[PDB]
Amino acid sequence: ADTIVAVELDTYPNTDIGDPSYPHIGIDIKSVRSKKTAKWNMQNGKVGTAHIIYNSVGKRLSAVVSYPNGDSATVSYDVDLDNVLPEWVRVGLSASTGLYKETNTILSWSFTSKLKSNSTHETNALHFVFNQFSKDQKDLILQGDATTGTDGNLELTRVSSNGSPQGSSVGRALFYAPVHIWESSAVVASFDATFTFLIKSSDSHPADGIAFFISNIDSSIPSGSTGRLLGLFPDAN
Amino acid sequence: ADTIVAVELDTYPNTDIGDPSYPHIGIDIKSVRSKKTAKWNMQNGKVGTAHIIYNSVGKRLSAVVSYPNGDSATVSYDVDLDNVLPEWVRVGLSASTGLYKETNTILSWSFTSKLKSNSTHETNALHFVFNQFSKDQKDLILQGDATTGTDGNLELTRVSSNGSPQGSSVGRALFYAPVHIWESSAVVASFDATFTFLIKSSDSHPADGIAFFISNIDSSIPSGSTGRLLGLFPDAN
Amino acid sequence: ADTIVAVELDTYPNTDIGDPSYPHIGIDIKSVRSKKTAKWNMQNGKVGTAHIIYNSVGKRLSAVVSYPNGDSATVSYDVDLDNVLPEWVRVGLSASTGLYKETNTILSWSFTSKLKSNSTHETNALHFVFNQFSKDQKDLILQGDATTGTDGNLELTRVSSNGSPQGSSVGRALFYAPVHIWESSAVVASFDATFTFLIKSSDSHPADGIAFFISNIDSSIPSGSTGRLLGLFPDAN
Amino acid sequence: ADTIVAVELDTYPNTDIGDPSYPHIGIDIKSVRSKKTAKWNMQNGKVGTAHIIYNSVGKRLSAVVSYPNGDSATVSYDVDLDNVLPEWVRVGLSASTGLYKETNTILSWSFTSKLKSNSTHETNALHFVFNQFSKDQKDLILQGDATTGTDGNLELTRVSSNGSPQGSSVGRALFYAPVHIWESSAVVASFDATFTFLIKSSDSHPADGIAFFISNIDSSIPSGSTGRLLGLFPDAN
Ligand SMILES: [Ca+2]
Ligand SMILES: [Ca+2]
Ligand SMILES: [Ca+2]
Ligand SMILES: [Ca+2]
Ligand SMILES: [Mn+2]
Ligand SMILES: [Mn+2]
Ligand SMILES: [Mn+2]
Ligand SMILES: [Mn+2]
């Protein structure tokens, strides 16, 4: 299976697989069952922003999700990602729907990775920012139901012609270039990512969520990873 | 054939195809016959740095090549790259040798493209920098004789076991992700690239040189582009 | 007196001091009489963005001003700023009104200067960006009528309690730190600045305008520089 | 007294004031007696690099110091700097000698602070980099014995005309602009800093060390803060 590290914005509590009994943000290390979660009030129809931060010195993966009214949730988990991730990864955004649904619209996404050595501040780095997506966004690998287009947004999951989200959808967008997430020579390796999103639903309950993830470079959507599995995992173990 | 915009660091004067009769830096738009050249004193075995700068406002492609002793050559050419490049490109480095030879060693390479739009300092951007290359550099597409590895450098053209550069060599390195080099909405599209290089030769004359290039995404080394064509062009037209 | 290089967003034509007979963007080198102008359609009450770009290689100072509907005005002037600016400068924003008036509201301002030297992509650099201004903005030197605060904006010229802009107003905001704008060793000295602005008027004609400027470090608003002199010049020479 | 947060590279063990019995890196929150230390092998005459990283999400101040042979020490301490630092600070480098001495040469220094909000990735930021210092470095406030000059370095403590360091020296360099280190509206505030240094001594033991610090904007060298106090504190409490 793929190796996955992810920060989930999980809009649907699947308490039977260890989600807490509320919408939450979580840090997922090789399992959909988050190593750490925090309560998260998803604001239906509002534009959220998620920031994710790690470096190899503090070894603490942190995420904060906030909305324009000021409400924010934060989660941090102490982990040495050198022991989990492969040296080369792809980075991406993933989302799903199941029996319940929501728009999983990404309005912008930025990522920076840096490997800093012992010379000065000489550095390998990758930084990309999309504040608008294009129709034929050649620097993104879209998987599953994900599309970009003319409104300048990335729809991770399927949205019908009348605008409304669909159930049992899964899709992802990975930056096209592999990322050198660690390198043994480097003194510091850090990454950060930010994405803005608009989760809207008129369902009885929104589901399932959006994740920033880092995977093996050849990562593909696990079969059947709609719903609770966020397009990240083949199962809920 | 391919579409090419390039800044060449041309170490060998091929005066029969329009080179001036001295080593030179030149701006190449869709031909090896540079639209503009400046005399360049290549300092054998010294680490040089090249800076290439363009934006869509001034519409002037500029390059400087310099050495630590302060010697510099500059060339600028007024051109609207919107009418030459496709919207999506790959960026890269190329070098060659022919009857005369040189190492075409790249020590570092950075590139930044930005599209800045109708509104605030919001932006799509790509920035990479390599101050050390890896042995298996997964975010670089190596073509022809280009290799990376263990000394942290990129060797664009063939170098034998005994450290000596080979003749009739041609190699390139392209960044893995396509680059959105222009977009009609953008008020400013800019790019800049820096590379450091070490050209060293024990030949009677060093050849052929090194270029930073921007090409169609599917650009491949043209057949017969060793020597004076710098791995960029199928012919000298 | 002071030394000034400026890009003016000139909302009021003072044809008796060399303005064209339309609102315009212009590049000012040591005089209010712009060396170069382009016609500019100021869209009353709309948020505009200005980008100013210079480097020591192309020696071309360029500016574009644009609005979200896509309308743009560009001006570029070939000038070697090494022979005009002192080595150390302060950078800032200026605006004024006179008999006619307008708000001169700055919503954001960013600036980057870099000196890139004889060797690798090593560098002195300064980058700041304000996307929200604070009430007591300690890294800004406010002069004349300039104020910040609580709406996250910078008001360059006086605005009364009832939200209305005042006449005969002049104000500026300079970044607190001096900027090393050129250095003889540097192979590339570049700067770029972006600001977003909201010029709104209920006057018969809006005036005077907004400029990004670079000055001697000790620059102060010249006496009598309201109105057509944009808070930059002591006279119209 | 001033409020000080610092990362000390402490070359001299003053075990009577709580230093461990070896050279160490430490995190100092309002006291020279580090909240956390790690053993550090200072490499006499070698160029070290120090990286310091904090963000308001993880609330973990981390530092790593390394040298070209690969040896590195790291220290991290969990602290919410919002509860310690004033909103506006200056940032600086500090060093001292006492009865023993060393060169406290800084070869480069970079700093970035960012306040990120809940809009997109809109941000206030300050970033500066010095990879070479100038004689009259107008964007640095030198205090005590600190000087810059023509060799491109910052000597924090006194060095005699023959090149040799002096005892009982203290000096600091602060970036000229105040830094907005936190702001209640921001979702993330982060800072990072890197400096490279060359500590050389021919004494019986080198002393005393170099610190990156963040202080009240009006911070000055406490009287008598040579030696063990690193120019940071009026006393060893
Ligand atoms: Ca769930
Ligand atoms: Ca040639
Ligand atoms: Ca005017
Ligand atoms: Ca000590
Ligand atoms: Mn969950
Ligand atoms: Mn040529
Ligand atoms: Mn004018
Ligand atoms: Mn100590």
CA distances from B110 to A50, B192, B196 (A): 28, 8, 9
Q: Which domains does chain B have, with CATH numbers?
A: 1-237 (2.60.120.200)
Q: Are B11 and B209 in contact (CB under 8 A)?
A: yes
Could you tell me which of B42, B109, B105, B108 has the C-alpha nearest to residue B69? B42
Q: Are D21 and D15 in contact (CB under 8 A)?
A: yes
Under DSSP, the state recorded for D153 is E
Helices (H), chain D: none
A102: which residues sit within 8 A by CB, 6+ positions away?
A11, A157, A165, A199, A200, A201, A203, A206, A207, A208
Tokens representing D196 are 């490279």
Which of A122, A138, A180 faces B139 most closely, judged by CB atoms? Answer: A180
Which of B107, B119, B196 faces C49 most closely, judged by CB atoms? Answer: B119
Phi, psi of B210 (to 5 degrees): -135, 140
Element (H, E) at C23: none
Q: Are C212 and C52 in contact (CB under 8 A)?
A: yes
Which of D124, D139, D183 faces C180 most closely, judged by CB atoms? Answer: D139
The label of the residue with tokens 């830094």 reads: D179
D49: chain B residues, CB-CB within 8 Å: none
DSSP-derived 3-state class of residue A96: strand
The label of the residue with tokens 């290439």 reads: B52
- CA–CA gap between residue B106 and residue B175 (Å, rounded): 14
Could you tell me which of D16, D175, D157 has the C-alpha nearest to residue D96? D157
Q: Are A169 and A101 in contact (CB under 8 A)?
A: yes
User: Which subunits count as partners of chain B given 3+ CB pairs below 8 Å?
Assistant: A, C, D
Which of B124, B128, B177 faces A176 most closely, judged by CB atoms? Answer: B177
Reported structure resolution in angstroms:
2.0
Q: How many CA within 13 A on the CB side of residue B172?
A: 28
CA distances from B53 to B163, B181, C56 (A): 33, 13, 10
- CA–CA gap between residue C63 and residue C75 (Å, rounded): 5
Write the DSSP assignment of chain B as a string of letters.
---EEEEEEE-S--GGGT--SS-EEEEEESSSS-SEEEE----TTSEEEEEEEEETTTTEEEEEEE-TT--EEEEEEE--GGGTS-SEEEEEEEEE-SSS----EEEEEEEEEEEEESSSS-EEEEEEEESS--TT-TTEEEEET-EE-SSS-EE-S-B-TTSPBPSS-EEEEEESS-EE---TTEEEEEEEEEEEEE----SSS---EEEEEEE-TT--PPTT-SGGGTTT-SS--
- CA–CA gap between residue D81 and residue D87 (Å, rounded): 10
Work out how many CB contacts closer than 8 A connect A with D: 92
CA distances from C53 to B189, C50, C103, C195 (A): 12, 10, 25, 12
Could you tell me which of C204, C201, C202 has the C-alpha nearest to residue C95? C201
The bridge status of strand D209-216 relative to strand C179-180 is: unpaired
Phi-psi region of C144 (alpha: psi -120 to 50; beta: other; left: phi over 0): left
DSSP-derived 3-state class of residue A200: coil
- CA–CA gap between residue C26 and residue C37 (Å, rounded): 4
Tokens representing C181 are 């704008």
- CA–CA gap between residue C28 and residue C20 (Å, rounded): 14
Residue A8, annotated ligand binder?
yes
Give CA angle at B32 (B27, B36), nearest 5°.
30
Could you tell me which of D92, D114, D112, D237 has the C-alpha nearest to residue D171? D92
Could you tell me which of A172, A181, A179, A190 has the C-alpha nearest to residue A231? A172
Closest Cα in chain A, distance from residue B174 (Å): 11
Could you tell me which of A200, A182, A202 has the C-alpha nearest to residue A191? A182
Residue D8, annotated ligand binder?
yes
In angstroms and rounded to an integer, the radius of gyration of the C-alpha atoms of chain D is 17
Locate the chain A residue with the closest alpha carbon to D116: A51
- CA–CA gap between residue B118 and residue C60 (Å, rounded): 22
Q: Are A53 and A192 in contact (CB under 8 A)?
A: yes
Helix, strand, coil percentages for chain D (3-state, nearest 5)? 5, 45, 50
A224: which residues sit within 8 A by CB, 6+ positions away?
A234
User: Which subunits count as partners of chain A given 3+ CB pairs below 8 Å?
Assistant: B, C, D
Write the DSSP assignment of C100-150 as a string of letters.
S----EEEEEEEEEEEEESSSS-EEEEEEEESS--TT-TTEEEEET-EE-S
Burial class (CB within 10 angstroms; exposed 0-12, middle 13-18, buried 19+) of C188: buried
Neighbours of C3 (CB within 10 A): 14
Q: Are D59 and D79 in contact (CB under 8 A)?
A: yes
Give CA angle at C201 (C200, C205), nearest 5°.
130
CA distances from A64 to B125, D58, D120, D202 (A): 23, 10, 13, 49
Which of C121, C191, C196 to probe the B interface (max B CBs under 10 A)?
A: C121
Phi, psi of B197 (to 5 degrees): -150, 155
Q: Are A199 and A206 in contact (CB under 8 A)?
A: yes
Tokens representing A204 are 């009885």
Q: Are C100 and C206 in contact (CB under 8 A)?
A: yes
Distance (angstroms) between ligand 5 centre and the Cα of B141 equals 38
Burial class (CB within 10 angstroms; exposed 0-12, middle 13-18, buried 19+) of A31: middle
The bridge status of strand A153-155 relative to strand A105-116 is: antiparallel
b/e string for C53-68 if b means 16 or more Cβ within 10 A? bbbbbbbbbbbbbbbe
Under DSSP, the state recorded for A165 is B
Phi-psi region of C181 (alpha: psi -120 to 50; beta: other; left: phi over 0): alpha
Inter-chain contact B129–A124, Cβ cutoff 8 Å? yes
Closest Cα in chain A, distance from residue D58 (Å): 6
Locate the chain C residue with the closest alpha carbon to A120: C122
Write the DSSP assignment of D48-105 as a string of letters.
EEEEEEEETTTTEEEEEEE-TTS-EEEEEEE--GGGTS-SEEEEEEEEE-SSS----E
Q: Are B76 and C80 in contact (CB under 8 A)?
A: no
Distance (angstroms) between ligand 6 centre and the Cα of B21 equals 9
Element (H, E) at C43: none
Residue B228, annotated ligand binder?
yes
Amino acid occupying residue C102: E
Q: Are B196 and B49 in contact (CB under 8 A)?
A: yes
DSSP-derived 3-state class of residue D188: strand
Distance (angstroms) between ligand 1 centre and the Cα of A11 equals 6
Burial class (CB within 10 angstroms; exposed 0-12, middle 13-18, buried 19+) of D135: exposed
Tokens representing D39 are 């053993």
Locate the chain A residue with the closest alpha carbon to D190: A53
- CA–CA gap between residue B193 and residue B77 (Å, rounded): 16
Q: Are A124 and B152 in contact (CB under 8 A)?
A: no
Could you tell me which of D65, D115, D106, D69 has the C-alpha nearest to residue D88? D115
Using a CB–CB cut-off of 8 Å, the residues of C that contact A are: 120, 122
Which of C36, C40, C55 to probe the B interface (max B CBs under 10 A)?
A: C55
Residue B192, annotated ligand binder?
no
Which of D119, D129, D177 faces C176 most closely, judged by CB atoms? Answer: D177
- CA–CA gap between residue B182 and residue B184 (Å, rounded): 7
Inter-chain contact D188–A53, Cβ cutoff 8 Å? yes
- CA–CA gap between residue C159 and residue C151 (Å, rounded): 13
- CA–CA gap between residue C148 and residue C132 (Å, rounded): 10
Burial class (CB within 10 angstroms; exposed 0-12, middle 13-18, buried 19+) of C94: buried
Tokens representing C99 are 């008999």
- CA–CA gap between residue D113 and residue C127 (Å, rounded): 10
